[PDB]
Amino acid sequence: FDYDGPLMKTEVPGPRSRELMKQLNIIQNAEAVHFFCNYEESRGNYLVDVDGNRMLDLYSQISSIPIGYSHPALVKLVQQPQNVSTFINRPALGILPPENFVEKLRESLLSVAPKGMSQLITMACGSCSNENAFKTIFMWYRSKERGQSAFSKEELETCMINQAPGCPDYSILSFMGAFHGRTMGCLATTHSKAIHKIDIPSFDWPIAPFPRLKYPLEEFVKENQQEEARCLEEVEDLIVKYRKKKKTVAGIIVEPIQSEGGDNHASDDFFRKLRDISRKHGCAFLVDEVQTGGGSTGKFWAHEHWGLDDPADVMTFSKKMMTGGFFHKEEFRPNAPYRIFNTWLGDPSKNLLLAEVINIIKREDLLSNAAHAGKVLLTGLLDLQARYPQFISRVRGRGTFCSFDTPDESIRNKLISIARNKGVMLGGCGDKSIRFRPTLVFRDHHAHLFLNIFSDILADF
Amino acid sequence: FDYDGPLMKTEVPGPRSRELMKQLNIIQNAEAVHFFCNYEESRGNYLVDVDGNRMLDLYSQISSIPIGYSHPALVKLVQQPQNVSTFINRPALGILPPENFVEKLRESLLSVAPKGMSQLITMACGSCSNENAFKTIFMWYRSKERGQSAFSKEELETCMINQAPGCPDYSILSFMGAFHGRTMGCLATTHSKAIHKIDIPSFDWPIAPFPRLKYPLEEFVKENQQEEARCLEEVEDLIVKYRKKKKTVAGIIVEPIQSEGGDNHASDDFFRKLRDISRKHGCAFLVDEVQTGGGSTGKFWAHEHWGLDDPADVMTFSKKMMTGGFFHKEEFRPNAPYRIFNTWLGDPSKNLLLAEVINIIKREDLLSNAAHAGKVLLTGLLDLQARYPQFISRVRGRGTFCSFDTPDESIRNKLISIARNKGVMLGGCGDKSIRFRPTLVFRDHHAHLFLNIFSDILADF
Numbered sequence: 041f042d043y044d045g046p047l048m049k050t051e052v053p054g055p056r057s058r059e060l061m062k063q064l065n066i067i068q069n070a071e072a073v074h075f076f077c078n079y080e081e082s083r084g085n086y087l088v089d090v091d092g093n094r095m096l097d098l099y100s101q102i103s104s105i106p107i108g109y110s111h112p113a114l115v116k117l118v119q120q121p122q123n124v125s126t127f128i129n130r131p132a133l134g135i136l137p138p139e140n141f142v143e144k145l146r147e148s149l150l151s152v153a154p155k156g157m158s159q160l161i162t163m164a165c166g167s168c169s170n171e172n173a174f175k176t177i178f179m180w181y182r183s184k185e186r187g188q189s190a191f192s193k194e195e196l197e198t199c200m201i202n203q204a205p206g207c208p209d210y211s212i213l214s215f216m217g218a219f220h221g222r223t224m225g226c227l228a229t230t231h232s233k234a235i236h237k238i239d240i241p242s243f244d245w246p247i248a249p250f251p252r253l254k255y256p257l258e259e260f261v262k263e264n265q266q267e268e269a270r271c272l273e274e275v276e277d278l279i280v281k282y283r284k285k286k287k288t289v290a291g292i293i294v295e296p297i298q299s300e301g302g303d304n305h306a307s308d309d310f311f312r313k314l315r316d317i318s319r320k321h322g323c324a325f326l327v328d329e330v331q332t333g334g335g336s337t338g339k340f341w342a343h344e345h346w347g348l349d350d351p352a353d354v355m356t357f358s359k360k361m362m363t364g365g366f367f368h369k370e371e372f373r374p375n376a377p378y379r380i381f382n383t384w385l386g387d388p389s390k391n392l393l394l395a396e397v398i399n400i401i402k403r404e405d406l407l408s409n410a411a412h413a414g415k416v417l418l419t420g421l422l423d424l425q426a427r428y429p430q431f432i433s434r435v436r437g438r439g440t441f442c443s444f445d446t447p448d449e450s451i452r453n454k455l456i457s458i459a460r461n462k463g464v465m466l467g468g469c470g471d472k473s474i475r476f477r478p479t480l481v482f483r484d485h486h487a488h489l490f491l492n493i494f495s496d497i498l499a500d501f
Numbered sequence: 502f503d504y505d506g507p508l509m510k511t512e513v514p515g516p517r518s519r520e521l522m523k524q525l526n527i528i529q530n531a532e533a534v535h536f537f538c539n540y541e542e543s544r545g546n547y548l549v550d551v552d553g554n555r556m557l558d559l560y561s562q563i564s565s566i567p568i569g570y571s572h573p574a575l576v577k578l579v580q581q582p583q584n585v586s587t588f589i590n591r592p593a594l595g596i597l598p599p600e601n602f603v604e605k606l607r608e609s610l611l612s613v614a615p616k617g618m619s620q621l622i623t624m625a626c627g628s629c630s631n632e633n634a635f636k637t638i639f640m641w642y643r644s645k646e647r648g649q650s651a652f653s654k655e656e657l658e659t660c661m662i663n664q665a666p667g668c669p670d671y672s673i674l675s676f677m678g679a680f681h682g683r684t685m686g687c688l689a690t691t692h693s694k695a696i697h698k699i700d701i702p703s704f705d706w707p708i709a710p711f712p713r714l715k716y717p718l719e720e721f722v723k724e725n726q727q728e729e730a731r732c733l734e735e736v737e738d739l740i741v742k743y744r745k746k747k748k749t750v751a752g753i754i755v756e757p758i759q760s761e762g763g764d765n766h767a768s769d770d771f772f773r774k775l776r777d778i779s780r781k782h783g784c785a786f787l788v789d790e791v792q793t794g795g796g797s798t799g800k801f802w803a804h805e806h807w808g809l810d811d812p813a814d815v816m817t818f819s820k821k822m823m824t825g826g827f828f829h830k831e832e833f834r835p836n837a838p839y840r841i842f843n844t845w846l847g848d849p850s851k852n853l854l855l856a857e858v859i860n861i862i863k864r865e866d867l868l869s870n871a872a873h874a875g876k877v878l879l880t881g882l883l884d885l886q887a888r889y890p891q892f893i894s895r896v897r898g899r900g901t902f903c904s905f906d907t908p909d910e911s912i913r914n915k916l917i918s919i920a921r922n923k924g925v926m927l928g929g930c931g932d933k934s935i936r937f938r939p940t941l942v943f944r945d946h947h948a949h950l951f952l953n954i955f956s957d958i959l960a961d962f
């Protein structure tokens with residue numbers, strides 16, 4: 041189920057959107073709002089707004105809508121009378137799970153478990169996924185140190201009043217350009233944009249450089265090899281340095297592709313070596329697939345491209361997955377209950393939808409489709425780069441997870457704004473990059489639709 | 502719609518529950534699981550399990566089910582064809598809200614706004630509500646320090662690498678016995694149980710004593726006055742002490758009644774004075790109504806009992822309210838977008854349900870019913886206390902938000918376990934307290950039902 045193409049009636053945001061934006065602005069800061077949407081009339085790759093505009097959506101609610109708007113298979117789930125309870129009786133999952141909790145996990149998340157990770161805990165978003173992944177890692181690392189010994193009296197007393205040794209001074213190593221959420225734990229590992237970080241208390245945790253590749257890749261083989269090697273060495277130096285400061289690095293967190301910080305890529309070789317460094321120093325390797333997970337790179341999890349039997353110790357997810365959570369190795373299993381815990385731990389209604397999402401992905405061969413449609417997209421971007429080097433540079437991607445840079449922030453926003461008025465929703469990341477996050481029902485013909493619109497925009501820009 | 506009473510077939514957990522518990526334990530630590538539930542057959546005050554047991558539920562998924570299981574008005578919402586899109590098309594609310602977003606907020610959360618708070622931001626749970634309330638407070642504090650001037654270059658650079666002055670060393674003051682969530686920010690303000698806190702890095706923030714009242718209240722007027730006065734003085738000393746340490750207290754967080762820490766109450770006078778101390782020192786007063794909010798104390802928000810025109814600067818909520826979020830004063834409104842932000846910011850499907858919940862609460866006069874049924878409950882508990890002083894002490898409550906202590910942790914768990922096998926789900930809090938969190942369709946005839954069952958339990962104990 042999909043429309044034949046975009047259809048614009050007004051500038052965006054249009055009159056009805058601007059009116060709803062003014063109403064909402066009374067109650068909260070609404071400057072981020074792009075426009076107001078008619079989700080009821082939205083279908084497949086097309087988002088319809090309240091002014092009747094119908095746009096090809098290559099941003100997908102910031103990479104969170106897996107198989108398009110109003111998918112008929114999802115419609116049918118909500119229509120089934122047996123599913124009513126799931127939507128209106130939300131359980132405290134940690135204590136009172138529903139009968140079908142394990143089976144529905146088998147139909148959904150367990151059927152796509154990463155290699156070597158038998159454990160799974162669910163969470164409602166990417167932030168509590170990473171926060172609880174951090175805690176799982178701290179618990180594991182302390183467990184290694186104390187061995188078979190019990191918690192000590194001193195630890196039980198001091199931990200209640202936020203003091204060592206009960207509350208250790210351990211760290212998670214993160215990368216410049218990273219984004220892992222905005223709760224105060226996650227935020228410490230985030231290094232995306234100053235407006236995200238400023239005025240908020242943080243943690244003194246080590247921050248390593250993420251490789252900046254030069255393009256085109258075939259003209260910078262040696263330079264990119266040396267850049268990645270410099271970054272890996274600086275990661276290792278930081279682990280050593282923080283051990284000496286007695287702020288031991290318990291874990292390393294990284295995105296397979298840095299999203300909010302500007303679609304920064306690195307070679308599979310780089311991630312394989314980073315994983316080895318993690319193991320070498322006893323650091324848990326935490327891979328954040330909140331935005332890369334769900335198939336858009338051509339594999340269900342982006343880390344699968346690395347080709348490792350032991351890719352990671354913990355892996356977080358959300359967005360496309362409908363629910364959050366994290367897979368992990370058996371050895372990271374909490375020793376006691378009520379340590380990794382909260383009221384809802386996700387939502388069974390989201391698991392119900394996800395099981396069907398995953399079924400659609402497999403039956404409609406959507407992983408391979410993302411590789412194919414992404415290849416068409418990227419080929420077209422490379423052509424546009426060759427024809428408009430004054431506006432387009434550093435064209436890059438994997439699957440439909442693509443992007444390019446513009447000369448400055450102002451042109452970037454202008455091109456997004458023109459594209460939108462011409463029927464194509466694009467996203468921005470970093471200071472001057474445009475990014476693509478198409479849903480999994482985006483095909484080679486949607487890529488051409490976009491490419492023809494953007495070609496005309498560029499010609500008289 | 503409700504059953505006539507409990508009906509037990511087996512001990513709890515029964516065979517089918519124990520089997521499902523074994524399956525779940527492969528994938529995660531499942532020791533917290535009480536039993537598995539048949540939500541499809543649950544109605545009103547009665548939770549039905551997978552072994553056919555039907556129990557009067559006075560715990561309500563840890564105080565998160567507002568108007569009982571399978572409420573007919575909520576069933577009808579899910580059955581409406583126009584509501585399908587809301588459940589299957591989840592928006593990135595911060596950028597692309599649905600057409601009805603503001604109106605549905607008017608039907609729900611804005612209709613129950615606390616006094617003096619015109620602003621509202623939504624969140625998906627209690628933990629991100631408090632985390633973002635903390636950040637809202639830190640931003641407000643720095644903003645009042647810097648005035649109507651720009652971010653400095655030094656601040657913009659240092660904040661990206663987790664350093665002052667971009668990342669200030671400010672604090673939130675919290676109370677012993679408190680519980681505000683388990684993400685690393687929230688967890689710093691939590692002082693409930695050592696298993697919650699141990700092995701997790703924390704923040705050096707001030708921790709004040711919460712008053713431990715003596716019962717019965719009319720025999721300890723002077724002693725409880727002096728206990729509360731001592732606590733208020735210690736709060737103020739801590740604010741002064743942390744100002745000198747250059748870890749300025751930007752805000753104070755408190756529950757109107759401490760839940761997870763053991764149902765600790767204080768007088769309305771105490772909270773009024775705490776609010777005054779907050780204002781006096783320029784600290785934002787953050788009231789956490791995640792568990793007290795939604796009517797069970799006899800007012801929609803528990804802080805309403807205080808009778809203040811200016812009760813707080815910020816107020817968080819979740820659980821009963823379906824979605825999370827927080828209300829706040831206009832002056833706490835963020836100056837720029839993308840500071841308080843995340844992908845989903847709650848869920849429109851939860852707002853849809855909440856609008857109906859609130860309509861039911863008002864039309865069925867459920868606030869007044871909680872006061873009355875709670876009075877019947879508490880009167881019965883006082884009678885049982887008089888008859889069984891060897892097992893029951895410190896009977897206390899407001900509305901149906903009631904509790905009592907037992908002599909030790911072991912008897913507490915034993916009485917919960919006996920009660921459950923006799924058809925009544927009770928909750929525990931603190932080390933040795935039993936607590937009540939009945940849904941809002943708990944009537945007095947349910948109170949008598951409980952009191953008659955438990956009275957027989959105590960005679961046989």
Ligand SMILES: *CC[C@H](CCC(=O)O)NCc1c(COP(=O)(O)O)cnc(C)c1O
Nearest residue numbers: 102165166167219220221330331842843844
């Ligand atoms: C996909 C967009 C979102 C960024 C929005 C923003 O806050 O600026 N990405 C989130 C993200 C998280 C946190 O997930 P959530 O709390 O927003 O649900 C964690 N890890 C990654 C890699 C991303 O992108």
Ligand SMILES: *CC[C@H](CCC(=O)O)NCc1c(COP(=O)(O)O)cnc(C)c1O
Nearest residue numbers: 381382383563626627628680681682791792
């Ligand atoms: C209602 C019980 C729940 C405790 C669950 C747990 O984590 O042990 N209360 C949580 C709570 C929060 C955090 O809510 P959430 O993250 O579980 O949604 C915040 N503030 C209060 C007062 C409570 O009790």
Ligand code: FES
Nearest residue numbers: 164165168626629
């Ligand atoms: S922190 Fe993840 S839903 Fe609130």
